[PDB]
Amino acid sequence: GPASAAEWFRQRSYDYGQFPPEDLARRKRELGLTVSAVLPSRNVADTVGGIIDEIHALNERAPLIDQILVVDADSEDGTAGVAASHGAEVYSENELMSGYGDAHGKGDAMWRALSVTRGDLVLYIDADTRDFRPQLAYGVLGPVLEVPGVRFVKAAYRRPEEDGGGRVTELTAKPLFNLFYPELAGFVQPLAGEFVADRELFCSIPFLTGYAVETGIMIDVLKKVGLGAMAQVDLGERQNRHQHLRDLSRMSYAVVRAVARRLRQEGRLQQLREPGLPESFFQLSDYLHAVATPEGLKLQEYVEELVERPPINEVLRV
Amino acid sequence: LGPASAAEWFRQRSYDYGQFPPEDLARRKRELGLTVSAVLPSRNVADTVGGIIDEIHALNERAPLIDQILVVDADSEDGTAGVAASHGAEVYSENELMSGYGDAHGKGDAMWRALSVTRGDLVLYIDADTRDFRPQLAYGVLGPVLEVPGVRFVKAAYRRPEEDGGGRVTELTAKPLFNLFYPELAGFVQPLAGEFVADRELFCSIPFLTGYAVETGIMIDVLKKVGLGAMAQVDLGERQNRHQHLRDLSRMSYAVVRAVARRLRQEGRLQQLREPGLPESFFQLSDYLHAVATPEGLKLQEYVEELVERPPINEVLR
Ligand SMILES: [Cl-]
Ligand SMILES: [Cl-]
Ligand SMILES: [Cl-]
Ligand SMILES: [Cl-]
Ligand SMILES: [Mg+2]
Ligand SMILES: [Mg+2]
Secondary structure: OOOOHHHHHHHHEEEHHHOOHHHHHHHHHHHOOOEEEEEEEOOOOOOHHHHHHHHHHHHHHOOOOOEEEEEEOOOOOOHHHHHHHOOOEEEEHHHOOHHHOOOOOHHHHHHHHOOOOOOOEEEEOOOOOOOOOOHHHHOOHHHHHHOOOOOEEEEEEEOOOOEOOOHHHHHHHHHHHHHHOHHHOOOOOOOOOOEEEEHHHHHOOOEEOOOOHHHHHHHHHHHHHOHHHEEEEEEEEOOOOOOOHHHHHHHHHHHHHHHHHHHHHHOOEOOOOOOOOOHHHOOOOEEEEEEEEOOEEEEEEEEOOOOEEOOHHHOOOO | OOOOOHHHHHHHHEEEHHHOOHHHHHHHHHHHOOOEEEEEEEOOOOOOHHHHHHHHHHHHHHOOOOOEEEEEEOOOOOOHHHHHHHOOOEEEEOOOOOHHHOOOOHHHHHHHHHHHOOOOOEEEEOOOOOOOOOOHHHHOOHHHHHHOOOOOEEEEEEEOOOOEOOOHHHHHHHHHHHHHHOHHHOOOOOOOOOOEEEEHHHHOOOOEEOHHHHHHHHHHHHHHHHOHHHEEEEEEEEOOOOOOOHHHHHHHHHHHHHHHHHHHHHHOOEOOOOOOOOOHHHOOOOEEEEEEEEOOEEEEEEEEOOOOEEOOHHHOOO
16 A cells, blocks of 8 residues: 555646546547446536536547436426436436435435446536536546556646635645545545546445535545545646535534544544533534624524435345 | 533623623722733734734723733744833743743743733733724623623634624634534634633643644633533624635644544543554644645645643642
C-alpha cells in the first residue's frame, strides 16, 4: 500500500490531459467495458438538458458512455421531461426499488439507480453543473481504464488561486478526515459528485440516503479497496454553486453524523450518549440551530432521520 | 436538576442586553463589592484597541463596571503595546507571563497566562479587533453573572449586518460537533464568541487549550464544571463581520475538531483513535494536510500546529 498521504497524492493524482478521449474510447472497446453515467437529478431542469447534450456530443468524437441514466428525485420543475426530451433514460426515484417508500434524498437516488444501470462501470455525475465541459464525463475514466489496481476515481477541480473546495468540504469534511480518516486527506474534492467505479463495488456497499452519501461512500470504498486503489483526476475548472450558510449547517451535520456512525461501527466511538446526560438532550435526528435575528435570538429545529440503504446486492432480484 | 432540554435552557438563559441597564449593573456590582477585569488578547491590533479602551473608559464614566483593562500583547510588530499603554490600559507581553512555560502557543496560551495578572473577581474576555466597539460589548454579558444567581458563565450572542447563526467555523464545525457530542451546548448562538465572562475562580479551575482551540475547550470544560444551568448568553445586537480566507478557516475548523476529539478521548467516548494497520506515517495529529487545486496542478499543502493543554492555573499558583 501507499507509504503516506503524500506518496499516495503523488502516485494517484492525474490531470485529464493524460487521457485523451479518443485513446480512452479505444481502450474501453479493447477492454470490452461499458459505462453508465448516472445523474441524480433534483430540480435541475435548467441544467440536465445541457449535460445530456454534451455527453452526446462527446460520444460523437469518442464513444465512452453507453447509458445516460437520469434519476428524477421527485422534481417539481420539469426535470424528468427535459431529460427525456434530450434523449436520456429517465426514471423517477419513487418507481425504483419501490418497496423502499418514497425518495429520501441524493443518496437514495444514487443507490436506487444501481437497479437499472447496465454498465460495467458506473460514473456518477452532478446534474446541476451550469457549463458542462466534456472532461467532466471522461476524465475520471482515465485511471480505471488504464492504471492497474485502480478501482475508484474521484474528480478534483477548482472554482474560477488555491481552491480547497466548497465550505462543507473545507470546514467539515477535510477537518474530520484529517483527524479520523487521514488516508482521505489527499483528496482535493472528497465530496465531489463525479466519481466512477466498477458496478460491483457500488452494489456491495451501503448508501447513506441524504447529503451524507458522498462521505459514506468515501469511507466505505477506502475500507473495501484500500487507498492504493483510489485515485483523483484534476478536471480543471468548476463554477461552484451558491447556497445559504444556514442550510450548509445541516449538510455539515450529516457529514458529522456519517463519520460518527462509521466510528461507532469500528468501535472507535463508544457510548456516544454521555452517561449522565438526560435522555431529553439526546436525539441525533434532531438538529438545533441557534440564530440571532433582527427580532431576537431563536432556536430553530430540524428533524432529519439518518436513513441507510443496505448493499443493493442483498435486496435486488439476482 | 438543571434544564431538561436545550430548548428549556434557551428560554431560561438567553437575554437581551436591553434587560441590563449599565447603571443598574453598576449598583449591583457595587453592592456585592465585585470587581471586573477585562482581558484583551491582542495580536497586531493597533488600529482597534485604542477605541475599545476609550469606549470602556467612557462607559465607566456613566457606570463603573470595568476595574482593570489588560492588553496581553503577542509581541505585535505594529505597535499594539504603545497604543494600548497610551490609552491607559495595562499592557503585558504574553511571553513574559508564566515564562517558565516558554514562548506562547497562540490565543489560548495568552488567555490562560492573563489569569496570573487579572485581579478582578470576574474576568471578561473581549476581542481586540472590533472596529466599532459599542457600550454593550462591555457590559451586556455581565448582566446575568451579576443579576442572576446560579449563573457563572455568560457568552455573547449577536448578528452580522435575515438569520445569523454565526461565521463559517461556528456554522459548519462547532454547531454540528456540539449537536452530536455536546448537545447541552447547541442553544448557544455564538459558541465560539471571543467575548464572554466568568468568575476568575472558575477560569482558574480549568485547563486552557492553546491556539484557536481555546474557545471550544472552554465551552466544554465550563459545561462539565458548573453545569448548563449556570451558563447563559446575552444578545448584543449587530457585530461587524471580520471576513477571512476559506483556506485559513480550514485550520481553525481543524482546531475545533481537535479540541472535541481530545475531550472525547479523555472521557473515554473515543478510543483506539489510530486504526490498527494504519502505518505510523499517516498518523500525526499536529499535521493538517490540505489538498488544493491550483492553476499549476493539484497541490498537497501542510500546516503544523502542536496542540498544548495548559493545566488549571490553580495547580501552578497556590
Ligand atoms: Cl448513528
Ligand atoms: Cl436518526
Ligand atoms: Cl489530542
Ligand atoms: Cl499535537
Ligand atoms: Mg439532537
Ligand atoms: Mg495528520
